[PDB]
């Protein structure tokens, strides 16, 4: 269902508010307004664990993307690597309904 994952990621970035990169994701979690977190597979384990701890404190849901950072960036539509990404606004996507 990774095809659907990519389709709804493209739709949610086209509709709502999206921030990319570790520093932006961490700032969003600290602000406590982020509604979804995605962590890539090849993300360093300490970085992953810190992000999961932040998300658990902020009660912001987090999902582990199957592919690596380059694949996550390609699916999100930009031409660079993205280890972690945060969705602030869903726009008109059903990504948060589940």
């Amino acid at each position: 269902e990774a095809q659907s994952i990519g389709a709804k990621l493209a739709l949610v970035i086209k509709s709502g508010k999206v921030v990319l990169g570790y520093r932006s994701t961490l700032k969003a979690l600290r602000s406590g307004k982020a509604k979804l977190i995605l962590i890539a597979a090849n993300t360093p384990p300490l970085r992953k664990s810190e992000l999961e701890y932040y998300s658990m404190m902020s009660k912001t849901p987090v999902h582990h993307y199957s592919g690596t950072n380059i694949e996550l960036g390609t699916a999100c539509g930009k031409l660079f690597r993205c280890s972690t990404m945060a969705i602030l606004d869903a726009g008109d996507s059903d990504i948060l309904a589940d």
Partner: protein, 135 residues
């Protein structure tokens, strides 16, 4: 939502106070003129109380039960939040930007923090807060 509330235990990981357990007293998410970034006014303890045994005198017991605090402005990026919470009635509004700009006021603030944290350590709770971090 915002987890960096007033009564919130964290630990400073950069600066002279790296790896030092601290508690927030006042968060400033938007930042002031000085410090144009999200920061927190915090109070921690530099030297933690030392363990006490039955083979040493009462004066030594008291001296190793003493506590020496610090008060600081620190960046959120240089904090790393802890899930734990410390509720202190004495540390309500002890520090502000005026105290951190006036050295006498911050000296009095450290005295107050020392007194209140010594009182809690004597009470005997938050031993995780009062013990040093092993890193």
């Amino acid at each position: 939502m915002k987890f960096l509330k007033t009564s919130r235990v964290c630990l400073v990981t950069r600066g002279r106070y790296a790896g030092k357990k601290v508690v927030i007293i006042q968060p400033v998410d938007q930042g002031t003129k000085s410090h144009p970034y999200g920061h927190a006014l915090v109070a921690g303890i530099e030297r933690y109380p030392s363990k006490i045994t039955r083979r040493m005198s009462k004066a030594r017991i008291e001296k190793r039960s003493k506590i020496k605090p610090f008060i600081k402005v620190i960046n959120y990026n240089h904090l790393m939040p802890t899930r734990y919470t410390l509720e202190l009635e004495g540390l309500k509004a002890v520090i502000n930007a005026d105290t951190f700009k006036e050295p006498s006021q911050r000296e009095e603030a450290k005295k107050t923090v020392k007194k209140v944290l010594e009182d809690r350590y004597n009470s005997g709770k938050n031993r995780w807060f009062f013990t040093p971090l092993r890193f």
